[PDB]
Amino acid sequence: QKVTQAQSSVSMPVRKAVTLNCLYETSWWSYYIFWYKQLPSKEMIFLIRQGSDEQNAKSGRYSVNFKKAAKSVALTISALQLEDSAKYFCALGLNTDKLIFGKGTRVTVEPRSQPHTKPSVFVMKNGTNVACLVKEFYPKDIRINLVSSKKITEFDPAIVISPSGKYNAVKLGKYEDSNSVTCSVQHDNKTVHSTDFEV
Amino acid sequence: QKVTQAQSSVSMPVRKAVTLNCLYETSWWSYYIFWYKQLPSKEMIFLIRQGSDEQNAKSGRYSVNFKKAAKSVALTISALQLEDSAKYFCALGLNTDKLIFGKGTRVTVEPRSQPHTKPSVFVMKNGTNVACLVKEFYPKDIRINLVSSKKITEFDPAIVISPSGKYNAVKLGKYEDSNSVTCSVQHDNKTVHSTDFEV
Amino acid sequence: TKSVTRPTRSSAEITCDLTVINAFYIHWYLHQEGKAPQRLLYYDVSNSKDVLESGLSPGKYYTHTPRRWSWILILRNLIENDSGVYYCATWDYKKLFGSGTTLVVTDKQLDADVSPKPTIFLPSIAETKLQKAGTYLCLLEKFFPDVIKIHWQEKKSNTILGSQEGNTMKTNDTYMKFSWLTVPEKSLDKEHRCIVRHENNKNGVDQEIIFPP
Amino acid sequence: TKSVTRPTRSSAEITCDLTVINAFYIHWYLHQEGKAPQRLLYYDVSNSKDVLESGLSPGKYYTHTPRRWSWILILRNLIENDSGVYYCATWDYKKLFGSGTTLVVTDKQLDADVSPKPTIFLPSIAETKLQKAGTYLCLLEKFFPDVIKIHWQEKKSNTILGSQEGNTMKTNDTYMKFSWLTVPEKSLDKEHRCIVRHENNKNGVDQEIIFPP
Secondary structure (H helix, E strand, O other): OOOOOOOOOEEEEEEEEEEEEEEOOOOOOOOOEEEEEEEEOOEEEEEEEEOOOOOOOEEOEEEEEEEEEOOOOEEEOOOOOOOOOOEEEEEEOOOOOOOEEEEEEEEEEEEEOOOOOOOOEEEEEEOEEEEEEEEEEOOOOOOOOOOOEEEEOOOOEEEOOOOOOOOEEEEEEEEOOOOOOOOOOOOOOHEEEOOOOOO | OEEOHHHHHHHHEEEEEEEEEEEOOOOOOOOOEEEEEEEEOEEEEEEEEEEOOOOEEEOOOOOEEEEOOOOOEEEOOOOOOOOOOEEEEEOOOOOOOOOOOOOOOOEEEEEOOOOOOOOOEEEOOOOOEEEEEEEOOOOOOOOOOOOOEEEEOOOEEEEEOOOOOEEEEEEEEEOOOOOOOOOOHHHHHHEEOOOOOOO | OOOOEEEOOOOEEOOOOOOOOOOOEEEEEOOOOOOOOOOEEEEEOOOEEEEEEOOOOOOOEEEOOOOOOOEEEEEEEEOOHHOOOEEEEEEEOOOOOOOOEEOOOOOOOOOOOOOOOOOOOOOOEEEEEEHHEEEEEEEEEEEOOOOEEEEEOOOOOOOOOOOOOOOEEEEEEEEEEEEEEEEEEOOOOEEEEEEHHHHOOOOOOOOOOOOOO | EEEOOOOOOEEEEEEEOOOOOOOEEEEEEOOOOOOEEEEEEEEEOOOEEEEEEEEOOOOOOEEEEOOOOEEEEEEEEOOOHEEEEEEEOOOOOEEOOOOOEOOOOOOOOOOOOOOOOOOOOOOOOOHHHHOOOOOOEEEEEEEOOOOOOOEOOOOOOOOOOOOOOOOEEEEOOOEEEEEEEEEOOOOOOOOOEEEEEEEOOOOOOOOEEEEEO
């Protein structure tokens, strides 16, 4: 009774398709294979169930490819979306029975192709904490360095997908003077300061 | 390992003495005998401890008579009071050990000798409930019958010792009219009504 | 002391108030009517394991420590012959005991509200001249677990007044108690209370019946 | 989902929110990092007994039913290798799961207050002309169990606003998170909230940070 998933991570863009592999192994004669997904808020949701006696089970945007002669089963998620970013588990399995899970594969969904836009950075203070705010920009090649002669801490930027399909980033940093600090950006071969917005 | 107490109840008046018996039985060579008392609010209080190797243990108003040749041990409560009305337990018995208790004897302490007084009854209503109230009287020979042609319920009287050393009694009773009801008392060969107090 | 009124085939939590720093073993005793207090088990606290008696299999008694130096005995699969008073004990010599907790195991024969319902009384008019005093009366009724405590307090004080209770008489399936108090002459027209402690009170907080002049 | 932060050699209560009428068996799963969800035990409810795994002796896991149809898994004698996410499950086919409960087992290395402490930010002055919008920023810090949930609400509504969080970055022994929200033009000068759910949040009630115009 073993379930093997030798896939660490996958990256597939929006409205494409993805196949996930699951090598089960058992000695029973009639079993079921369940598929579960785990949100980052730690919730398990039943996706699809493949009974090992009748043909391929599909339910909406999910499809299961079953190789009974081999030991391979495969989940298809067609027409991907933005909340298909989870961790997916293969389970093997009347009220007393247990499910045997695999180690789980992670699907990270990337946005589509967009023309390049420009950052338009800002800055905001709280006495000693600063925060450079970068507005929407499509390619993820960003460098959000700040300017201060007196540096204490500088955490990493946090790039996240906007609801427009582009990216936003915040980079915190604690300094002493915290008033003569102005952030800069090296996005897409053209430097963007924050003094042109100031006046 | 047995502890026997063949005494169901004792009645002894105030500032007298009482002996309680406890027949233990064991095969150990060195043991202790503890005495506990239980209030009616279910609290166990350690009274006295008799070590079976040295002489008789006394602590204040408690004394223990020890017969090592026989199997008899005996607690003395000298100069009785009014809060010596409990249930007393004999126990037999380093942090892991257990105590073996007996079935327990009950001591009910009676007040002293007083001259006879007279009841002086009253009455109090709540629409349908009545309650004859009897003030202080020393000998407990009371009969607190009420008068009504229309009787529904009549609970028993509750005779309790007053802080003066005499007795008070309440007898409830539910009736319909509940306004023309007057209680009477047959205490000590002289009947006491409740119409002489009314005017 | 309080009461616990679980039904049959259920679970019951029995906590003891005996607060002791750096204990080693916590014993558990059971007292039933006309019998002796016997030890059920004792709980090692440096190893966290129960040592039972020679009478039953495991899966009945469990000692739970929710915080440090606090213990709860959990009973499981309650039968009607499990009802009694439960103490907890520790050695020091003497053996201290832990104020008792009555457990009542019923067959869910309540079917209504079983809170104590007062029907308070007022002193008579003829008592308040020829005695220079007056007496209250605070009759409670229709309450099931019978571990009830009536005590009287002043209008604003922390004194316990000289009340004189009665016996917890039993109706056909419920119970009934009454307490009463006599107050002297120059403390007569004030406020008085008939605080009633019980398990099946509303919101857990015990009642507080206010008495007129 | 929440967190539990008991120390070593202690007891932990793990309750699950999965409310099901007329269950028969309640399974209990454990998920650790880079491993699979394995079943620890399952609790019969018509007989009230635990059936364990092939790995440990009894005296570690106990299933407690405080009320009818409510279950708590009590762990005993906690070791540092007991930490993970605990689910409860029932069959129906499919097998429903119970939203998880992280348990963190530490060596009492906190030694201070570990509540999330906000240091909120205000939109820049130049953003509020050439964008017709403004952005808040709600930085939290110094909180240990790391199961935290920041969501933004309106001044008086029940809507969840389009916040955009960041990664729970780790300081030398504590943690730090920040969330931020962009609001449009004609809903700008109102009040906004930065509700923060956490375990070591004072009085149990979660925070509620009010944001100016």
